[PDB]
């Protein structure tokens, strides 16, 4: 009469989908990705990611990649660090790629688990606790390169204008650029001049990423830029997010994945709070500021709804914000963002949301 079936695909089209990475910190061995339709808040499905999973969607939109850690008996027994490849429409497991047992275990900053712009390599952060960048060749299904040159650096910023190049932020206040060969090994590298003072004006690692440049905000509300239109990265800054009135209430940035760039307009979005002082760099947003990176001026400010992380969709002119449990959807087609809806209870403990690529 009725019969329960499986083998089904996600009901909503890929263009409607977002991915909320739920760390489930209270039960961190059962982290997962929740898939939602941003147009109506419908829950579409999920992918389990064991202990402290990280997630990204393949640049071609066909697959979901996760990174996680298993042990034979969870809290004892042999460790297995892996990347998994899952089908994006079926939400089923396809392949496991073994990693060395030093993949980063940490909060879900975008830059810990990325891909080259051509989609041919997964690029991830290792910490043993010595740092290096790991390269996974997607076509081969293997780990292919420890980038030991990145020792003392942190996080991966892919260059959207080259197929197999990325940058990392180093302890000298500069950027190291790595250009991979077609075999996923380092072909060439370069190190920028010092961009920021590590001691005096530390930057948040989250980039506001353009096609050929990246902007970074600092603990004290300054902005730094790395231009990679050429082979050598040119760095600049600081310019201040703050006017005189802002300085009077001690406005500073705070959050995790706390900035975004709308590439067509050059507008940078930043989570901000007043009464800044030592130790407030991860505070929830009192406001979202919208900065014109060309004129170096603020063009809008709106209430932040306690958001901690965001992400931007270029084509649909959207910004998502996330306060740890709830996702807000904003229309950013004009300088002043407009709140469209809130998806309540999208996660228990998430600091990362991402769009399906379109």
């Amino acid at each position: 009469r009725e019969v329960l079936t499986g083998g089904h695909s996600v009901s909503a089209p890929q263009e409607n989908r977002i991915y909320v990475m739920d760390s489930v910190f209270m039960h961190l061995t059962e982290s997962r990705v929740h898939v939602y339709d941003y147009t109506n808040g419908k829950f579409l499905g999920m992918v389990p990611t064991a202990f402290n999973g990280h997630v990204q969607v393949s640049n071609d939109g066909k697959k979901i990649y996760t990174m996680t850690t298993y042990h034979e008996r969870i809290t004892r027994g042999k460790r297995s660090d892996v990347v998994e490849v899952w089908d994006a429409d079926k939400l089923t497991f396809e392949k496991e790629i073994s990693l060395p047992p030093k993949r980063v275990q940490g909060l879900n900053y975008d830059g810990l688990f990325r891909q080259t712009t051509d989609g041919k390599f997964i690029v991830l952060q290792n910490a043993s606790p010595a740092t290096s960048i790991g390269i996974v060749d997607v076509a081969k299904g293997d780990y292919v390169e420890d980038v030991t040159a990145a020792a003392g650096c942190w996080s991966v910023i892919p260059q959207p204008n080259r197929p197999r190049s990325f940058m990392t932020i180093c302890g000298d206040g500069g950027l190291l650029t790595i250009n991979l060969g077609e075999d996923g090994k380092v072909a060439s590298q370069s190190r920028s001049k010092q961009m920021f003072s590590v001691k005096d004006d530390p930057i948040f690692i989250a980039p506001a990423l353009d096609k050929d440049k990246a902007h970074f905000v600092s603990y004290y509300g300054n902005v730094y830029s790395a231009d990679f239109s050429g082979d050598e990265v040119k760095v600049d800054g600081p310019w201040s997010l703050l006017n005189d009135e802002d300085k009077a209430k001690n406005w500073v940035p705070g959050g995790y994945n706390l900035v975004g760039l709308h590439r067509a307009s050059g507008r940078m979005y930043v989570f901000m709070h007043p009464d800044g002082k030592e130790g407030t760099h991860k505070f929830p947003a009192a406001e979202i500021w919208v900065m014109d990176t060309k004129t170096k001026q603020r063009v809008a400010r709106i209430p932040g709804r306690d958001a901690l992380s965001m992400t931007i969709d270029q084509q649909r002119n959207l910004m998502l914000t996330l306060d740890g449990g709830n996702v807000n959807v904003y229309d950013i087609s004009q300088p002043e963002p407009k709140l469209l809806r809130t998806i309540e209870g999208a996660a228990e403990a998430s600091l990362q949301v991402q769009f399906h690529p379109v």
């Binding site: 009469r1 079936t5 089904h8 059962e30 499905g45 939400l91």
Partner: protein, 122 residues
């Protein structure tokens, strides 16, 4: 009529522990978890076995036999948790019992969600 096929009904009515056919459900409704009342969310597998029982349909005044299958092999959905117990009985009446995992014989027994499959008139 519409009351007999949840695909034709308002989502808010169907996704409720009070929906008439959900009368001995223990777990998260699959229709809230990316599936429907009769389809598992993507990447979860139907249980070949289930607990069973009858539910009264207040719309047409008739009683119907329901089979309460789970979807399996993914971690807990967490949405629309129900714990209804009409005509539910302990483990010495094993197939009327809902305090056990009806994913127990699946390839992977991890419980994802549960649902209520209409067998026919009681």
């Amino acid at each position: 009529h519409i009351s007999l096929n949840p695909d034709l009904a308002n989502e808010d009515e169907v996704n409720s522990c009070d929906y008439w056919r959900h009368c001995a459900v223990d777990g998260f409704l699959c229709s809230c978890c990316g599936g429907t009342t009769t389809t598992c969310p993507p990447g979860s597998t139907p249980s070949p076995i289930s607990w069973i029982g009858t539910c009264h349909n207040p719309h047409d005044g008739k009683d119907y036999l329901i089979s309460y299958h789970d979807c399996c092999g993914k971690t807990a959905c967490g949405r629309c948790q129900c714990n209804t117990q009409t005509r539910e009985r302990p483990g010495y009446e094993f197939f009327l019992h809902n305090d056990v995992n009806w994913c127990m014989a699946n390839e992977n027994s991890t419980f994802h969600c549960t649902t209520s499959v209409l067998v026919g008139l009681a």
